[PDB]
Short mmCIF file of C-alpha atoms and ligand atoms in Angstrom, two decimals:
data_model
loop_
_atom_site.label_atom_id
_atom_site.label_comp_id
_atom_site.label_asym_id
_atom_site.label_seq_id
_atom_site.Cartn_x
_atom_site.Cartn_y
_atom_site.Cartn_z
CA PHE P 1 14.09 2.78 -4.65
CA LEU P 2 17.28 1.11 -3.75
CA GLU P 3 18.99 4.18 -2.47
CA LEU P 4 16.07 4.95 -0.20
CA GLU P 5 15.93 1.50 1.32
CA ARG P 6 19.74 1.43 1.92
CA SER P 7 19.86 5.01 3.40
CA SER P 8 21.19 5.07 7.04
CA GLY P 9 20.13 8.59 8.06
CA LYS P 10 16.90 10.55 8.34
CA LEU P 11 18.59 13.55 6.66
CA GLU P 12 19.97 11.68 3.67
CA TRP P 13 16.80 9.60 3.23
CA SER P 14 14.70 12.83 3.04
CA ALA P 15 17.14 14.22 0.39
CA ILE P 16 16.84 11.00 -1.75
CA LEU P 17 13.02 11.18 -1.55
CA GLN P 18 12.81 14.81 -2.12
CA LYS P 19 14.81 14.64 -5.28
CA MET P 20 12.88 11.73 -6.63
CA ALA P 21 9.62 13.58 -6.12
CA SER P 22 11.25 16.60 -7.86
CA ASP P 23 12.39 14.44 -10.87
CA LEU P 24 8.79 13.20 -11.23
CA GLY P 25 7.69 16.87 -11.37
CA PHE P 26 6.62 17.64 -7.76
CA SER P 27 7.29 21.08 -6.24
CA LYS P 28 6.47 20.61 -2.55
CA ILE P 29 6.03 17.29 -0.77
CA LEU P 30 5.33 15.89 2.65
CA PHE P 31 6.06 12.60 4.25
CA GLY P 32 4.35 12.21 7.55
CA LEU P 33 4.44 9.25 9.90
CA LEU P 34 2.84 8.32 13.17
CA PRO P 35 3.26 5.17 15.14
CA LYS P 36 0.81 2.60 16.39
CA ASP P 37 -2.36 3.70 18.26
CA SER P 38 -1.25 7.32 18.09
CA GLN P 39 -3.23 10.15 16.70
CA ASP P 40 -1.05 13.09 17.98
CA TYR P 41 -0.49 14.42 14.43
CA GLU P 42 1.52 17.33 15.61
CA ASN P 43 4.15 15.19 17.19
CA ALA P 44 4.63 13.06 14.10
CA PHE P 45 7.77 12.27 12.05
CA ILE P 46 7.71 14.91 9.30
CA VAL P 47 9.93 15.24 6.18
CA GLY P 48 9.60 17.42 3.02
CA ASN P 49 9.72 20.99 1.64
CA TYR P 50 6.20 22.25 2.62
CA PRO P 51 6.34 26.03 3.32
CA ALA P 52 7.54 26.55 6.95
CA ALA P 53 4.83 29.23 7.51
CA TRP P 54 2.19 26.89 6.16
CA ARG P 55 3.15 24.15 8.45
CA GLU P 56 3.40 26.01 11.69
CA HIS P 57 0.18 27.77 10.75
CA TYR P 58 -1.50 24.43 10.15
CA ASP P 59 -0.28 23.10 13.59
CA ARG P 60 -1.38 26.15 15.62
CA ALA P 61 -4.78 26.26 13.69
CA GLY P 62 -5.50 22.55 14.56
CA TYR P 63 -5.81 21.91 10.78
CA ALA P 64 -5.35 18.16 11.11
CA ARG P 65 -8.96 18.11 12.14
CA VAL P 66 -9.95 20.25 9.25
CA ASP P 67 -7.72 18.98 6.40
CA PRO P 68 -10.01 16.70 4.28
CA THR P 69 -6.97 14.49 3.28
CA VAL P 70 -6.16 13.59 6.94
CA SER P 71 -9.58 11.84 7.51
CA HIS P 72 -9.35 10.26 4.05
CA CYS P 73 -6.14 8.59 5.13
CA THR P 74 -7.92 7.03 8.08
CA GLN P 75 -10.52 5.59 5.85
CA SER P 76 -8.59 4.60 2.70
CA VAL P 77 -5.34 3.21 1.24
CA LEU P 78 -6.19 4.86 -2.14
CA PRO P 79 -4.89 8.29 -3.27
CA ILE P 80 -6.95 11.49 -2.78
CA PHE P 81 -6.58 14.28 -5.32
CA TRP P 82 -6.76 17.92 -4.11
CA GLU P 83 -9.91 18.60 -6.23
CA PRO P 84 -12.06 21.55 -5.10
CA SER P 85 -14.90 19.19 -4.19
CA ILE P 86 -13.27 17.88 -1.02
CA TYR P 87 -13.33 21.23 0.62
CA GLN P 88 -16.86 21.26 1.82
CA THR P 89 -17.12 22.87 5.32
CA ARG P 90 -16.88 26.65 6.17
CA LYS P 91 -13.36 26.09 7.53
CA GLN P 92 -12.34 23.76 4.70
CA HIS P 93 -13.14 26.61 2.23
CA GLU P 94 -10.88 28.92 4.34
CA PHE P 95 -8.28 26.08 4.57
CA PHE P 96 -8.19 25.81 0.71
CA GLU P 97 -7.95 29.63 0.38
CA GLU P 98 -4.97 29.69 2.84
CA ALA P 99 -3.33 26.54 1.30
CA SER P 100 -3.43 28.29 -2.19
CA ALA P 101 -1.77 31.39 -0.62
CA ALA P 102 1.07 29.05 0.54
CA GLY P 103 1.34 27.67 -3.03
CA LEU P 104 -0.39 24.29 -2.50
CA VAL P 105 -3.39 24.07 -4.86
CA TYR P 106 -2.80 21.04 -7.15
CA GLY P 107 -1.70 17.68 -5.80
CA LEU P 108 -2.43 14.26 -4.34
CA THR P 109 -2.14 12.51 -0.96
CA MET P 110 -1.25 8.85 -0.73
CA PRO P 111 -2.14 7.28 2.60
CA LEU P 112 0.34 5.14 4.52
CA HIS P 113 -0.59 2.22 6.73
CA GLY P 114 2.57 0.34 7.76
CA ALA P 115 3.13 -3.25 8.92
CA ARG P 116 3.65 -2.19 12.65
CA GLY P 117 0.44 -0.09 12.61
CA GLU P 118 2.02 3.26 11.57
CA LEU P 119 -0.36 5.86 10.01
CA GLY P 120 0.84 8.59 7.68
CA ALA P 121 0.93 9.95 4.11
CA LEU P 122 3.12 11.02 1.17
CA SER P 123 1.48 14.11 -0.26
CA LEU P 124 2.83 15.55 -3.49
CA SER P 125 2.05 18.94 -5.03
CA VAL P 126 2.49 19.86 -8.71
CA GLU P 127 2.58 23.39 -10.25
CA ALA P 128 0.25 23.43 -13.31
CA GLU P 129 -1.67 25.98 -15.45
CA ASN P 130 -5.00 24.37 -14.51
CA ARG P 131 -6.43 21.21 -12.77
CA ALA P 132 -6.57 19.21 -16.05
CA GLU P 133 -2.80 19.81 -16.55
CA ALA P 134 -2.11 18.73 -13.00
CA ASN P 135 -4.07 15.57 -13.41
CA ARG P 136 -2.25 14.83 -16.59
CA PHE P 137 1.22 15.32 -14.89
CA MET P 138 -0.05 13.28 -11.82
CA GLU P 139 -1.40 10.36 -13.89
CA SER P 140 1.72 9.93 -15.97
CA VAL P 141 3.69 9.25 -12.83
CA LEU P 142 0.84 7.48 -10.83
CA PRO P 143 2.23 3.84 -11.21
CA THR P 144 5.79 4.96 -10.18
CA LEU P 145 4.41 6.84 -7.19
CA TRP P 146 2.48 3.86 -6.00
CA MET P 147 5.61 1.75 -5.66
CA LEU P 148 7.41 4.77 -4.18
CA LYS P 149 4.80 5.46 -1.41
CA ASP P 150 5.28 1.86 -0.05
CA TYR P 151 9.08 2.02 -0.37
CA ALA P 152 9.03 5.37 1.38
CA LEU P 153 6.72 3.87 4.07
CA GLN P 154 8.87 0.70 4.58
CA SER P 155 12.26 2.55 4.76
CA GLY P 156 10.82 5.70 6.37
CA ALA P 157 9.22 3.71 9.24
CA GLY P 158 12.63 2.22 10.04
CA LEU P 159 14.31 5.65 10.36
CA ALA P 160 11.36 7.44 12.02
CA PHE P 161 11.31 5.32 15.09
CA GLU P 162 13.88 2.58 14.96
CA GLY U 1 -10.85 -3.11 -14.98
CA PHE U 2 -10.01 -1.83 -11.47
CA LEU U 3 -13.13 0.15 -11.04
CA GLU U 4 -15.60 -2.63 -11.50
CA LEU U 5 -13.92 -4.18 -8.45
CA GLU U 6 -14.78 -1.17 -6.38
CA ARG U 7 -18.30 -1.21 -7.62
CA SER U 8 -18.94 -4.87 -6.97
CA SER U 9 -22.16 -5.18 -5.01
CA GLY U 10 -21.24 -8.45 -3.22
CA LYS U 11 -18.46 -10.87 -2.26
CA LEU U 12 -19.24 -13.49 -4.98
CA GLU U 13 -19.09 -11.03 -8.00
CA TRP U 14 -16.04 -9.21 -6.52
CA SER U 15 -14.06 -12.51 -6.22
CA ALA U 16 -14.92 -13.31 -9.89
CA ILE U 17 -13.76 -9.83 -11.11
CA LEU U 18 -10.45 -10.39 -9.19
CA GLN U 19 -9.92 -13.99 -10.46
CA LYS U 20 -10.36 -12.88 -14.10
CA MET U 21 -7.98 -9.83 -13.65
CA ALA U 22 -5.18 -11.91 -12.07
CA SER U 23 -5.71 -14.52 -14.81
CA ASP U 24 -5.52 -11.83 -17.59
CA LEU U 25 -2.21 -10.64 -16.07
CA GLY U 26 -0.96 -14.26 -16.37
CA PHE U 27 -1.55 -15.71 -12.88
CA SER U 28 -2.52 -19.42 -12.45
CA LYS U 29 -3.56 -19.40 -8.84
CA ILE U 30 -4.31 -16.55 -6.48
CA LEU U 31 -5.34 -15.93 -2.91
CA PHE U 32 -6.78 -12.81 -1.31
CA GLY U 33 -6.82 -13.15 2.46
CA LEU U 34 -7.88 -10.57 5.02
CA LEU U 35 -8.04 -10.54 8.81
CA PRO U 36 -9.64 -7.94 10.97
CA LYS U 37 -8.25 -5.51 13.50
CA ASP U 38 -6.55 -7.02 16.42
CA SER U 39 -6.68 -10.58 15.28
CA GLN U 40 -4.31 -13.24 14.28
CA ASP U 41 -6.64 -16.21 13.97
CA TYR U 42 -6.17 -17.26 10.39
CA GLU U 43 -8.75 -20.00 10.22
CA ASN U 44 -11.67 -17.57 10.43
CA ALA U 45 -10.48 -15.00 7.97
CA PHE U 46 -11.95 -13.78 4.74
CA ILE U 47 -10.51 -15.91 1.93
CA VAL U 48 -10.99 -15.59 -1.87
CA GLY U 49 -9.14 -17.25 -4.79
CA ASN U 50 -8.46 -20.52 -6.67
CA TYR U 51 -5.80 -22.08 -4.37
CA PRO U 52 -6.08 -25.91 -4.38
CA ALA U 53 -8.81 -26.89 -1.83
CA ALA U 54 -6.63 -29.77 -0.53
CA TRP U 55 -3.69 -27.37 -0.12
CA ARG U 56 -5.88 -24.75 1.70
CA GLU U 57 -7.33 -27.48 3.98
CA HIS U 58 -3.91 -29.14 4.53
CA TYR U 59 -2.41 -25.73 5.45
CA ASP U 60 -4.99 -25.13 8.18
CA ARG U 61 -4.82 -28.49 9.89
CA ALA U 62 -1.13 -28.13 9.94
CA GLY U 63 -1.05 -24.73 11.45
CA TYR U 64 0.98 -23.48 8.42
CA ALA U 65 0.11 -19.88 9.13
CA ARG U 66 2.91 -19.96 11.65
CA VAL U 67 5.21 -21.63 9.24
CA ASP U 68 4.55 -19.86 5.99
CA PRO U 69 7.56 -17.55 5.49
CA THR U 70 5.25 -15.12 3.58
CA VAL U 71 2.80 -14.83 6.53
CA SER U 72 5.50 -13.41 8.95
CA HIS U 73 6.87 -11.24 6.12
CA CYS U 74 3.34 -9.68 5.80
CA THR U 75 3.48 -8.81 9.60
CA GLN U 76 6.87 -7.03 9.04
CA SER U 77 6.61 -5.44 5.58
CA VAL U 78 4.36 -3.66 3.03
CA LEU U 79 6.77 -4.76 0.21
CA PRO U 80 6.29 -7.87 -2.00
CA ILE U 81 7.97 -11.22 -1.17
CA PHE U 82 8.96 -13.55 -4.03
CA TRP U 83 8.66 -17.34 -3.53
CA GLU U 84 12.46 -17.83 -4.03
CA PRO U 85 13.94 -21.03 -2.41
CA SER U 86 15.91 -18.92 0.07
CA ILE U 87 12.71 -17.92 1.66
CA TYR U 88 12.31 -21.27 3.27
CA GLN U 89 14.90 -21.66 5.91
CA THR U 90 13.62 -23.79 8.79
CA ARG U 91 13.18 -27.49 8.76
CA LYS U 92 9.43 -27.12 8.71
CA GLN U 93 9.72 -24.53 5.90
CA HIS U 94 11.71 -26.97 3.71
CA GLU U 95 8.82 -29.53 4.13
CA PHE U 96 6.29 -26.68 3.54
CA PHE U 97 7.97 -25.82 0.17
CA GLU U 98 8.11 -29.52 -0.80
CA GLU U 99 4.34 -29.88 -0.05
CA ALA U 100 3.45 -26.50 -1.70
CA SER U 101 5.24 -27.69 -4.96
CA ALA U 102 3.20 -30.93 -4.83
CA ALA U 103 0.02 -28.72 -4.78
CA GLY U 104 1.37 -26.80 -7.81
CA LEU U 105 2.50 -23.60 -6.05
CA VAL U 106 6.23 -23.21 -6.77
CA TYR U 107 6.63 -19.78 -8.51
CA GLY U 108 4.96 -16.60 -7.30
CA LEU U 109 4.82 -13.50 -5.12
CA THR U 110 2.92 -12.31 -2.11
CA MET U 111 1.79 -8.76 -1.64
CA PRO U 112 1.06 -7.73 1.97
CA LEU U 113 -2.13 -5.84 2.88
CA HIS U 114 -2.47 -3.41 5.77
CA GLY U 115 -5.85 -1.63 5.56
CA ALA U 116 -7.14 1.58 7.00
CA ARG U 117 -9.08 -0.22 9.65
CA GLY U 118 -6.26 -2.32 10.86
CA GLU U 119 -6.98 -5.21 8.61
CA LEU U 120 -4.03 -7.57 7.88
CA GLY U 121 -3.92 -9.76 4.78
CA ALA U 122 -2.27 -10.45 1.39
CA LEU U 123 -2.79 -10.92 -2.37
CA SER U 124 -0.56 -13.81 -3.37
CA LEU U 125 -0.20 -14.65 -7.06
CA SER U 126 1.35 -17.89 -8.53
CA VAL U 127 2.98 -18.55 -11.91
CA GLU U 128 3.23 -21.70 -14.00
CA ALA U 129 6.65 -21.26 -15.49
CA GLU U 130 9.39 -23.47 -16.69
CA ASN U 131 12.03 -22.05 -14.45
CA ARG U 132 12.55 -19.30 -11.77
CA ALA U 133 14.22 -16.86 -14.22
CA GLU U 134 11.25 -17.01 -16.59
CA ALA U 135 9.02 -16.59 -13.60
CA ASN U 136 10.83 -13.63 -12.23
CA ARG U 137 10.67 -11.82 -15.49
CA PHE U 138 7.00 -12.28 -15.90
CA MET U 139 6.36 -11.14 -12.45
CA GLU U 140 8.57 -8.04 -12.93
CA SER U 141 6.77 -6.91 -16.15
CA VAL U 142 3.36 -6.87 -14.33
CA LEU U 143 4.72 -5.62 -10.91
CA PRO U 144 3.57 -1.89 -11.33
CA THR U 145 0.00 -2.98 -12.34
CA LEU U 146 -0.11 -5.30 -9.36
CA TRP U 147 1.09 -2.65 -6.99
CA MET U 148 -1.96 -0.58 -7.69
CA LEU U 149 -4.19 -3.58 -7.77
CA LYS U 150 -3.26 -4.94 -4.38
CA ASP U 151 -4.47 -1.63 -2.77
CA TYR U 152 -7.53 -1.51 -5.08
CA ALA U 153 -8.36 -5.08 -3.94
CA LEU U 154 -7.61 -4.23 -0.25
CA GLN U 155 -9.87 -1.07 -0.28
CA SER U 156 -12.90 -2.75 -1.96
CA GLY U 157 -12.24 -6.19 -0.43
CA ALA U 158 -12.27 -4.81 3.15
CA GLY U 159 -15.63 -3.10 2.55
CA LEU U 160 -17.35 -6.46 1.77
CA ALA U 161 -15.28 -8.89 3.95
CA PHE U 162 -16.82 -7.61 7.18
C1 K5J D 1 0.78 13.63 11.11
S1 K5J D 1 1.05 12.20 10.30
O1 K5J D 1 2.22 12.45 9.56
O2 K5J D 1 1.09 11.20 11.28
C2 K5J D 1 -0.23 12.00 9.28
C3 K5J D 1 -1.16 10.95 9.43
C4 K5J D 1 -2.29 10.87 8.61
C5 K5J D 1 -2.52 11.86 7.62
C6 K5J D 1 -1.60 12.90 7.44
O3 K5J D 1 -1.82 13.91 6.57
C7 K5J D 1 -1.71 13.71 5.18
C8 K5J D 1 -2.27 14.96 4.47
C9 K5J D 1 -1.54 16.28 4.81
C10 K5J D 1 -1.37 17.26 3.64
O4 K5J D 1 -0.68 16.94 2.67
N1 K5J D 1 -1.95 18.54 3.66
C11 K5J D 1 -1.81 19.51 2.57
C12 K5J D 1 -1.75 20.98 3.02
C13 K5J D 1 -2.68 21.75 2.10
C14 K5J D 1 -2.49 21.60 0.61
C15 K5J D 1 -3.52 20.75 1.31
C16 K5J D 1 -3.09 19.41 1.75
O5 K5J D 1 -3.67 18.36 1.52
C17 K5J D 1 -0.52 12.98 8.31
C1 K5J D 2 -5.30 -15.35 6.91
S1 K5J D 2 -5.22 -13.79 6.32
O1 K5J D 2 -5.89 -13.85 5.10
O2 K5J D 2 -5.74 -12.98 7.33
C2 K5J D 2 -3.61 -13.45 6.06
C3 K5J D 2 -2.90 -12.50 6.80
C4 K5J D 2 -1.52 -12.32 6.62
C5 K5J D 2 -0.81 -13.11 5.71
C6 K5J D 2 -1.51 -14.05 4.94
O3 K5J D 2 -0.86 -14.88 4.12
C7 K5J D 2 -0.29 -14.44 2.91
C8 K5J D 2 0.58 -15.58 2.35
C9 K5J D 2 -0.17 -16.90 2.08
C10 K5J D 2 0.26 -17.66 0.83
O4 K5J D 2 0.10 -17.16 -0.28
N1 K5J D 2 0.81 -18.95 0.92
C11 K5J D 2 1.22 -19.72 -0.25
C12 K5J D 2 1.01 -21.25 -0.12
C13 K5J D 2 2.29 -21.91 -0.60
C14 K5J D 2 2.81 -21.52 -1.96
C15 K5J D 2 3.37 -20.82 -0.74
C16 K5J D 2 2.74 -19.55 -0.36
O5 K5J D 2 3.33 -18.52 -0.12
C17 K5J D 2 -2.87 -14.24 5.17
#
């Protein structure tokens, strides 16, 4: 947590965070941040190792308005697990199908709501045999990740805009 | 007991669930405060806790919201602030600390709250300890529990405050 905080560059900060996430057992992750009063998701500060095809697909498809975790983040400060039950609409079912093709099935999204009104998330994806395995690997790290999502948000909001 | 918080039907039962939890963790006095979007008028905020009534009342007539070093910290960070002496720097802040100690609030930490609806607040927790070192170690050993709690309190507490 110290290294993150003390990091002076976007590039080095992302590497510190990326590795931490990896050490915890997370394959692909995404740190997204928007500033105050903004909802232009596609022109947000993005960091992570999410598949490049997945992400440009997502942007062109207008998937911010379809991803069930994006609206959750506007409504809560609590984590949302990528359970099948959140994919409810016709498109959300297609979204899930396409997300799984890109290798993102299991995981959780932790909403970010910064002191200067910034809105974002730290999503983390785990590779597990089944959902019960993924919840087990996600719960064992859950208290560490909670402290991490606010350190990431406090340091990451400095570098994103300031 | 985090989930019974969520499930609390009203303000009165919710406050009691929170008071007990904080107490079980080892906290003498606590305060949960929450303001709504686009507001910075601290006298008409949603307040819960067991802070001395004379202290609370003294603090408002004195306009201590603009003097409390933890109140401005909350407007700048999502990270906890410990009630170390170095926190009080101004002349008014030195008097504030002196008066806070008289009311029995000398050791403790404040956790900022920044909700999904733009709500600004905090969960401050105080410790009756013999010295700062003893205080800092107790606070450190419960810190990961509290990190989850402060968001658990903010998510449920915002849904009843307004
Ligand atoms: C733009 S921003 O950075 O300002 C911002 C603000 C608010 C929410 C936010 O999105 C968080 C959730 C995004 C996400 O992980 N999607 C993956 C992709 C697929 C596996 C399924 C997921 O849940 C982004
Ligand atoms: C009004 S609100 O509820 O909307 C709100 C919004 C932002 C900050 C906030 O204050 C958090 C810090 C208050 C506090 O614990 N003070 C004690 C009192 C004395 C021991 C020294 C302290 O630190 C309150």
